[PDB]
Write a protein that binds this DNA or RNA. Structure first.
Ligand SMILES: Nc1nc2c(ncn2[C@H]2C[C@H](O)[C@@H](COP(=O)(O)CP(=O)(O)OP(=O)(O)O)O2)c(=O)[nH]1
Ligand SMILES: [Mg+2]
Ligand SMILES: [Mg+2]
Ligand code: NA
Length: 322
DNA sequence: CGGCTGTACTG
DNA sequence: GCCG
DNA sequence: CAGTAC
């Protein structure tokens, strides 16, 4: 729908990122939740009591909401360390998180050029840096489509049965995608094996894969570029999963991140655990509470089965932003 | 006040 | 940050 | 393990 509280959320996201780039992840999280609630509220919040009655907004956040509602500004926004923009700049480099941004800043660096030349970069960060600009641009949905087909085409050349599906923001129907997350599996439950390596080599030869950021037996985080004049380098993820965990893999991979964590929260209450691998029962825990026995798996052939089992009404991918 | 998702590759 |  | 990321 429409965000009847934009005048508020914009001020808030500013403080939210402030805390975020600074490493205060938990406080940032509180704000993120707050903002998602604000956005999806049927009307402009008009009173402090009204704000509080909303889940994810407590005394503290309500105070801020009202001050903006009445002043159109948030005092808090004027006392934000002048280091935030540089920390944001540095943490925008894929592979570089808040600890690295903070390290570089105390070392005196202040620009990507400072980093590029002087600073010490891990192999990933170097890749993150050379593709800085391209990585902040959200690609058109159409380009995501092209990338999914590329992967799927190269994958079917090893097996016609292999199933390739673009997830994340793409399956949620967004018009722009930060990256492309492709999930690959196979109906027979066994053919997905031993093809990951060769599929990557194939795409790497074809020139499509330009750089590798992370290689796992079943997980791949890399960089790609479509054939054609002046195409940008797009960040790409690929995960290969056995057919049995397909529903969960697809659920996890479609996200969003907050929707996922929210489902996993609920899962734990009902005494269960939800992971990209499966929906299970309460894990066994000893006197201290330490995992000692994995819960048994509840078959979930489809995403619908996962919601059903958690007592939740099915939600289309496009309505899973959080 | 303590939890706030669960899991995985890199160095 | 918020919540149980 | 610390850091980063899905
Ligand atoms: N449980 C869990 N799932 C996650 C997490 N991060 C990502 N996922 C899942 C859900 C998420 O949908 C998927 C891909 O993550 P991205 O590609 O980083 C963000 P996307 O939503 O795709 O949108 P984009 O901004 O790319 O256009 O992995 C996380 O922290 N936890
Ligand atoms: Mg994505
Ligand atoms: Mg991704
Ligand atoms: Na980063």
């Amino acid at each position: 729908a429409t965000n009847h509280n934009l005048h508020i959320t914009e001020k808030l996201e500013v403080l939210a990122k402030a805390y975020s780039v600074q490493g205060d992840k938990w406080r940032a999280l509180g704000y993120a939740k707050a903002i998602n609630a604000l956005k999806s509220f049927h009307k402009p919040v008009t009173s402090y009591q009204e704000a509080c009655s909303i889940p994810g907004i407590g005394k503290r956040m309500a105070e801020k909401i009202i001050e903006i509602l009445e002043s159109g500004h948030l005092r808090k926004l004027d006392h934000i360390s002048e280091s935030v923009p540089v920390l944001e700049l540095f943490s925008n480099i894929w592979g570089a998180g808040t600890k690295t941004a903070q390290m570089w800043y105390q070392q005196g660096f202040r620009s990507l050029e400072d980093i590029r030349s002087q600073a010490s970069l891990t192999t990933q960060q170097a890749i993150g840096l050379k593709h800085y600009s391209d990585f902040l641009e959200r690609m058109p949905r159409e380009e995501a489509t092209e990338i999914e087909q590329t992967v799927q085409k190269a994958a079917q050349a090893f097996n016609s049965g292999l199933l390739c599906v673009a997830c994340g923001s793409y399956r949620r129907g967004k018009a722009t995608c930060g990256d492309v997350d492709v999930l690959i599996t196979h109906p027979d439950g066994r053919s997905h094996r031993g093809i990951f390596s060769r599929l990557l080599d194939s795409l790497r030869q074809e020139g499509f894969l330009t750089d590798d950021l992370v290689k796992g037996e079943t997980k791949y985080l890399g960089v790609c570029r479509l054939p054609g004049p002046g195409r940008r380098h797009r960040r790409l993820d690929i995960i290969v999963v056995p057919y049995s965990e397909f529903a969960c893999a697809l659920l996890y991979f479609t996200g969003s991140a907050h929707f996922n964590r929210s489902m996993r929260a609920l899962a734990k209450t009902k005494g269960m655990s939800l992971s990209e691998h499966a929906l299970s029962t309460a894990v066994v825990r000893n006197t201290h509470g330490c995992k000692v026995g994995p819960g048994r798996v509840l078959p979930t052939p489809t995403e619908k089965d996962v919601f059903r089992l958690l007592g939740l009404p099915y939600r289309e991918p496009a309505e899973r932003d959080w």
